[PDB]
Design brief:
The structure is cut from a larger assembly and holds 4 copies of chain A, 2 copies of chain B and 1 copy of chain G. Chain B contains no helices and 2 strands. Chain B is mainly beta. The chains are: A mainly beta, B mainly beta, G mainly alpha. Chains in contact: A-B, A-C, A-D, A-E, A-F, A-G, B-D, B-G, C-E, D-F. Chain E: This is Complement C5 beta chain. Chain E: It comes from Homo sapiens (Human).
C-alpha cells in the first residue's frame, strides 16, 4: 500500500464560496493528471465545477483545484440541496464522498445610527455587506423590523 | 439494478442443464435517497446485532 | 456567594506530546464573571505511560496573572506518557477547598497505531503574530520509518478556507 | 421422487409386486387470470391435465379454480414507505415539550370557539374566535401570542342572540314553525290532543332559558 | 489544535479528507463544540 | 397557505377513465361513475393545464365520455324519478341519493333539468321522511357489493341511510331549492345528531360528521361530534406525519384490498371531507400524506365508494390550496375625503407597513376579488 | 457492449483515460463596460466563467 493519496477539503462547502481543494499523492514517479469535481447528489449527473490538476515531482506531486458552487446552478425550490458529491478521478484511483453544503455565505453588519430612539424619530440604518471572501458582496439585501412583542412592523 | 430471464422448460431426465445464470446485477448510480431508519424497539434490549 | 469563583481552561488542547513540556492555562472567573487575576491556584496530576502504570505527579503552584487572569503551568511529562488526568484548585489560603473552586480534566495521547507521530515545536506563544513577519516553526516527525518520510506537507487555513499549502523536505541532517 | 416399490433414477423399473401400471393423474398449473367479470372479479383455472388421470388414478387434488378481486394503483405511488408493525398511537401520545414557548391554544370564551385550532401558535400569531350559531360577538375577536405565552386576551364574549327550538325527550309536544326564536318569543308546546301534563301550556324562553320541566316536556295524555 | 486521531485532528481542524490510507472522517460529526480561545 | 402536499393521481387515471368493461352488473355504471369525478378532479385545471410528463388525456375524449355517462345515468332513472340499476328492478332511495350526488357535479358541462331533480327529491322526501330517523330504504334489502358498502348493524343503521341521503340531497339542493326539502333536511339532521350523541361505531360517526359538515358548520353538537372524531384519530410520530382511523379490528393484516380495508379507506375519506369542510388544512395534511402512501395497498376493496370518496377528498384539498393562495390588492379610502392607501398583499409581500389614519372622515376598505385571506385592523388612541 | 459503456463510466480509472479535454467553446462574449473576470486559453465543455 505504498501508492496513496489525500484529498483535503473544508468540513462543509459554503454555497457560492470559492473553495480550495488540495491533493497529495505518494509512491508515484510517472507524472499524471487528476480531476477534482463537485457533482450533484445522489445522481452525480450535473457537475457544478471541475478542476484539472497535474501531479509531478515538478510539483512534488502536490496540487490544488479552486472549485465553486454558483447558487443558481443548484435546483433550489422548497427542498434546498443538503449534500453534494466531492469526487476525484485519476488513472490510478476514483473516489467520491458526500460533502455537506451550507448557504451561510458572508456577513451582514447592521449599523443603526443610535442604540436608543424616542418616538417621533426616523432611524438611519445601513448594512455592511461582505462575502465569505470579505469582499463587498454587491448583493440585494432586505431588512425586517420586529417590535418587542415579536410583531413584524416593516420590511424594506 | 437487476436483470432477469425465465426458464421456458426445465431440463430433466439428464438433458443439458440451463448452464447460464438467471439473474444479472449491475452497479447503478441511484436517483433516490434511502428512506431506511433503525428501529428503536422502545425499552427492549437491543443486541449489538 | 460562599464559592464565588469558578474556573475554566483557556487555549489548552487536552492532547499530549510526550516529553515535550505540555502547557496548561486556566482563567479564574466570577459569577457575573470578570478576570479576577489575583487568585493563587495549584495543580495535582496523575499519569499513565504503559501497561497502565498509574504514576502520580508532584503538585505545582502559580498565581493568576493580574491582567490576563491566566494562571499558567507546564508539565515536563514522561517521554512515554500515554494519558494524564489532573485537578486544578484555588489555593487562596483564606478559602478552604470546599470554597476554593476546583475542577478536574483529562488529556489523551494521539494514539497512533504505527507509533508514527508529527510533533511541532510550538510553546503556544501567548503573543499575537504580527502581520508580515515570517513565522518559523520547526516540525519533527518521529516514526519507525522516518527514512521513508521524504517530506511533510502543511496547510494554513483561515475561516472556512485553505489559503496556503506546501511541502517541507527532509534535510540530510535527518 | 419415487413411490416405494419403484426404483431406478427416475423410478423407471418396477418391483415384481407393483400393480395397476400406468395409473396417472396430477395437476397442471393455472391459466393466466381472466379479464375482470361483470363484478370486477378475475379468475384462473387448472385442468388436471399433467397427466390426465387414468385407470383409477386420482383427480388432480384440491380447488380447480381461483377467483380474485380486480385492483389498481390509484395514486402516484412514487416509492414504498418503511411501515412497521404496531406503528400507530392513539391520542394517548405524550404532549411535546413546547420548549419554544409558543403560546398553547387558548380556551375560547363562554359561547366562543376558535376558527383555526392548532397545537401551538407562533409569537405574534393571532387567533380568531367566533360565536356559536345562536350567539353574537361583543368585543375584539382576536388574541395575539406574546413572547411569554400569554394571549393579549381580548374583552370579547359571545352574547346569546337567540334560543333554539328546544329539545326534550318527548317527540312532538312542540310547534314546527321555526328552528330558532328571538329571546322572549313564545314556544307553543302544543299538545296533539289538548291536554297538559306538566309546566305551562304555552311558555317562552326567558332570555337565559325556558326553565322548562326537564323531566317531562308536556307528556299530555291521549 | 491536536486530536485523538488523524481523523479527529482533521475534524477539529475543520477539514475532511478522502484517502485510501486506512482512515476516514465519517467517524465524527458536527458536535456543538464550544470551547474558548 | 403553509404546507402543500402534492397528492395526485398516477398515470392510472387513464384506467380510472377507461374503466373495467362496461356491461352487466352495471359494469357500465361502475365504469362511468369514476369518469365524472376524474372530470371534476381535472377541473382543478392544473392537470388539464399540465400533463406533459405523459401523453395528454384528450379533452374531447373526456367530454364525449361525460356526455355518454349522462346518457347512461338517465337509463337508470325510474319513471317516478326514483332509481333502479335494473330497468324493472325495485326502486332504491340509495341509488337515488347516489345519482343526486353525481348530478350535482356534472352541471358545468351538462346540467340535468331541474324539474327531474325536484321530482326525484320530492319522491324521496315525501315517501320516506320519518318522525324519528329518516329515509329508511323502501323496497331493496339486497345489497350490491362493488356499488354498495357495508350497512351498519341494525342499531342506528338509519345513521348510514340518513347520512348518505343527506349528502346526496345537499349536493342536489343548489339545483332544486324547495322549503319542504329544507324542512326534511333540518329533521334528518336533528335525528342523525340525536342518534350520534351515543357515539355509534366509528364509521357511522365519520359519515354523520361528513353529513353535518354540509349543514350548520357551527352547530354545537356538530362541533362536539367533530371533537369525538378527532379524539378517535390514529397518528404516527409525535407531530403527526400520518393520520387515519381504524375500527372493527381492522388492525388485522390485509395485504390486499377487502371489506375491512374498504371500511378504513372510506371512514378516513369521510373524516378528511369533514375536516376539509372545516377548511382545516393543517389537520388535513397528515391525512393526505397517509392516503398518498396507499398503505393497505390497492385501496379499500376497490369499491366504487372508497375510490370515489377518496378522489373527491383529494380534489377538495387541491381546490383549498389554490383558494388560500394569497393575492389581494387592498384599496382603502375615506368616505368623503380621498383615497388613503393601497396594499398589494401577495405571497411574496404578505405584510405592508401600518398606516396612520390621519383624516377625520369615515374609512372604507376593500379589495379586488383576488385570492386568499387577510386581516385588517384599526386601533384608536384617546386621552381620557 | 454493455460493458464498454457502463463499466468504463462507473470505474474510468480501470480503463485508459482521455482525461484531458477535447471539445471547447469559443472565447466568451464581451459585455458592454465589462469583462470576464478570469481570462483563459481553454474553455472546456461545462466550464463556468464569471
Amino acid at each position: 500500500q505504498e501508492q496513496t493519496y489525500v484529498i483535503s477539503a473544508p468540513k462543509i462547502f459554503r454555497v457560492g464560496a470559492s473553495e480550495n481543494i488540495v491533493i497529495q499523492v505518494y509512491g508515484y514517479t510517472e507524472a499524471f493528471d487528476a480531476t477534482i469535481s463537485i457533482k450533484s447528489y445522489p445522481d452525480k449527473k450535473f457537475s457544478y465545477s471541475s478542476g484539472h490538476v497535474h501531479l509531478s515531482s515538478e510539483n512534488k506531486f502536490q496540487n490544488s483545484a479552486i472549485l465553486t458552487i454558483q447558487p443558481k446552478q443548484l435546483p433550489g425550490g422548497q427542498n434546498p440541496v443538503s449534500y453534494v458529491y466531492l469526487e476525484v478521478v485519476s488513472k490510478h484511483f476514483s473516489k467520491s464522498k458526500r460533502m455537506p453544503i451550507t448557504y451561510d455565505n458572508g456577513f451582514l453588519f447592521i449599523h443603526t445610527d443610535k442604540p436608543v430612539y424616542t418616538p417621533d424619530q426616523s432611524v438611519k440604518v445601513r448594512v455592511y455587506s461582505l462575502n465569505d471572501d470579505l469582499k463587498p458582496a454587491k448583493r440585494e439585501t432586505v431588512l425586517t423590523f420586529i417590535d418587542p412583542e415579536g410583531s413584524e412592523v416593516d420590511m424594506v | 439494478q437487476s436483470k432477469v430471464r425465465s426458464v421456458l422448460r426445465p431440463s430433466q431426465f439428464g438433458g443439458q442443464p440451463c448452464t447460464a445464470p438467471l439473474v444479472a446485477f449491475q452497479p447503478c448510480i441511484p436517483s433516490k435517497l434511502c428512506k431506511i431508519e433503525e428501529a428503536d424497539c422502545k425499552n427492549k434490549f437491543r443486541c449489538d446485532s | 456567594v460562599l464559592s464565588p469563583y469558578k474556573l475554566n481552561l483557556v487555549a489548552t488542547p487536552l492532547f499530549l506530546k510526550p516529553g515535550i513540556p505540555y502547557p496548561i492555562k486556566v482563567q479564574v472567573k466570577d459569577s457575573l464573571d470578570q478576570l479576577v487575576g489575583g487568585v493563587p491556584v495549584t495543580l495535582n496530576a496523575q499519569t499513565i505511560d504503559v501497561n497502565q502504570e498509574t504514576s502520580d505527579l508532584d503538585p505545582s503552584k502559580s498565581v493568576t496573572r493580574v491582567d490576563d487572569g491566566v494562571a499558567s503551568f507546564v508539565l515536563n511529562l514522561p517521554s512515554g506518557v500515554t494519558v494524564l488526568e489532573f485537578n486544578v484548585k484555588t489555593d487562596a489560603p483564606d478559602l478552604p477547598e470546599e470554597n476554593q473552586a476546583r475542577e478536574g480534566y483529562r488529556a489523551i495521547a494521539y494514539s497512533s497505531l504505527s507509533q508514527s507521530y508529527l510533533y511541532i515545536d510550538w510553546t503556544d506563544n501567548h503573543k499575537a503574530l504580527l502581520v508580515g513577519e515570517h513565522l518559523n516553526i520547526i516540525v519533527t516527525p518521529k516514526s519507525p520509518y522516518i527514512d521513508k518520510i521524504t517530506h511533510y506537507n502543511y496547510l494554513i487555513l483561515s475561516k472556512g478556507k485553505i489559503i496556503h499549502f506546501g511541502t517541507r523536505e527532509k534535510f540530510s541532517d535527518a | 421422487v419415487c413411490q416405494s416399490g419403484t426404483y431406478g433414477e427416475n423410478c423407471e423399473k418396477q418391483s415384481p409386486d407393483y400393480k395397476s401400471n400406468a395409473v396417472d393423474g396430477q395437476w397442471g398449473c393455472w391459466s393466466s387470470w381472466s379479464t375482470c367479470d361483470a363484478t370486477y372479479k378475475r379468475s384462473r383455472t387448472r385442468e388436471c391435465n399433467n397427466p390426465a388421470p387414468q385407470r383409477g388414478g386420482k383427480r388432480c387434488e384440491g380447488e380447480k379454480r381461483q377467483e380474485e378481486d380486480c385492483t389498481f394503483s390509484i395514486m402516484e405511488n412514487n416509492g414504498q414507505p418503511c411501515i412497521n408493525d404496531d406503528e400507530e398511537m392513539k391520542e394517548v401520545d405524550l404532549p411535546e415539550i413546547e420548549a419554544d414557548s409558543g403560546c398553547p391554544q387558548p380556551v375560547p370564551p363562554e359561547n366562543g370557539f376558535i376558527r383555526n385550532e392548532k397545537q401551538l401558535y407562533l409569537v405574534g400569531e393571532d387567533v380568531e374566535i367566533s360565536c356559536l350559531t345562536g350567539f353574537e360577538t361583543v368585543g375584539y375577536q382576536y388574541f395575539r401570542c406574546l413572547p411569554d405565552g400569554t394571549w393579549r386576551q381580548g374583552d370579547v364574549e359571545c352574547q346569546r342572540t337567540e334560543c333554539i327550538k328546544p329539545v326534550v325527550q318527548e317527540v312532538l309536544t312542540i310547534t314546527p314553525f321555526q328552528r330558532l326564536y328571538r329571546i322572549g318569543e313564545s314556544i307553543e308546546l302544543t299538545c296533539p290532543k289538548g291536554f297538559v301534563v306538566a309546566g305551562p301550556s304555552r311558555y317562552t324562553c326567558q332570555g337565559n332559558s325556558w326553565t322548562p320541566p326537564i323531566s317531562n316536556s308536556l307528556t299530555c295524555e291521549k | 489544535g491536536g486530536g485523538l486521531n488523524n481523523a479527529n485532528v482533521f475534524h477539529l481542524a475543520g477539514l475532511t479528507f478522502l484517502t485510501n490510507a486506512n482512515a476516514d472522517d465519517s467517524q465524527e460529526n458536527d458536535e456543538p463544540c464550544k470551547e474558548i480561545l | 397557505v403553509g404546507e402543500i402536499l402534492s397528492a395526485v393521481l398516477s398515470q392510472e387515471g387513464i384506467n380510472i377513465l377507461t374503466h373495467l368493461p362496461k356491461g352487466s352488473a352495471e359494469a357500465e355504471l361502475m365504469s362511468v361513475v369514476p369518469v365524472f369525478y376524474v372530470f371534476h378532479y381535472l377541473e382543478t385545471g392544473n392537470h388539464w393545464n399540465i400533463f406533459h410528463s405523459d401523453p395528454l388525456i384528450e379533452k374531447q375524449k373526456l367530454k364525449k365520455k361525460l356526455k355518454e355517462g349522462m346518457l347512461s345515468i338517465m337509463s337508470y332513472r325510474n319513471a317516478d324519478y326514483s332509481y333502479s340499476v335494473w330497468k324493472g328492478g325495485s326502486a332504491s332511495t340509495w341509488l337515488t341519493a347516489f345519482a343526486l350526488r353525481v348530478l350535482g357535479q356534472v352541471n358545468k358541462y351538462v346540467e340535468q333539468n331541474q324539474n327531474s331533480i325536484c321530482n326525484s327529491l320530492l319522491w324521496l322526501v315525501e315517501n320516506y321522511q320519518l318522525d324519528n330517523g329518516s329515509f329508511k330504504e323502501n323496497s331493496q334489502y339486497q345489497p350490491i357489493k362493488l356499488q354498495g358498502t357495508l350497512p351498519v348493524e341494525a342499531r342506528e343503521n338509519s345513521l348510514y341511510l340518513t347520512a348518505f341521503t343527506v349528502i346526496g340531497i345537499r349536493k342536489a339542493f343548489d339545483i332544486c331549492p324547495l322549503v319542504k326539502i329544507d324542512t326534511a333536511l333540518i329533521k334528518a339532521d336533528n335525528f342523525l345528531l340525536e342518534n350520534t350523541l351515543p357515539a355509534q361505531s366509528t364509521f357511522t360517526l365519520a359519515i354523520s360528521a361528513y353529513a353535518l359538515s354540509l349543514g350548520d358548520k357551527t352547530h354545537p353538537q356538530f362541533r362536539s361530534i367533530v371533537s369525538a372524531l378527532k379524539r378517535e384519530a390514529l397518528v404516527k410520530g409525535n407531530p403527526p406525519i400520518y393520520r387515519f382511523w381504524k375500527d372493527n379490528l381492522q388492525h388485522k393484516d390485509s395485504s390486499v384490498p377487502n371489506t375491512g380495508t374498504a371500511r378504513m379507506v372510506e371512514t378516513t375519506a369521510y373524516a378528511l371531507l369533514t375536516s376539509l369542510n372545516l377548511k382545516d388544512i393543517n389537520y388535513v395534511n397528515p391525512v393526505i400524506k397517509w392516503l398518498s402512501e396507499e398503505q393497505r395497498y390497492g385501496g379499500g376493496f376497490y369499491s366504487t365508494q372508497d375510490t370515489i370518496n377518496a378522489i373527491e377528498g383529494l380534489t377538495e384539498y387541491s381546490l383549498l390550496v389554490k383558494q388560500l393562495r394569497l393575492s389581494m390588492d387592498i384599496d382603502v379610502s375615506y368616505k368623503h375625503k380621498g383615497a388613503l392607501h393601497n396594499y398589494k398583499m401577495t405571497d411574496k409581500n404578505f405584510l405592508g407597513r401600518p398606516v396612520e389614519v390621519l383624516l377625520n372622515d369615515d374609512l372604507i376598505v376593500s379589495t379586488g376579488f383576488g385570492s386568499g385571506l387577510a386581516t385588517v385592523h384599526v386601533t384608536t388612541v384617546v386621552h381620557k | 457492449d454493455e460493458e464498454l459503456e457502463h463499466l468504463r463510466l462507473l470505474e474510468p480509472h480501470c480503463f485508459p483515460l482521455s482525461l484531458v479535454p477535447t471539445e471547447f467553446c469559443p472565447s466568451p462574449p464581451a459585455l458592454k463596460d465589462g469583462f470576464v473576470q478570469d481570462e483563459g486559453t481553454m474553455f472546456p465543455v461545462g466550464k463556468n466563467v464569471v
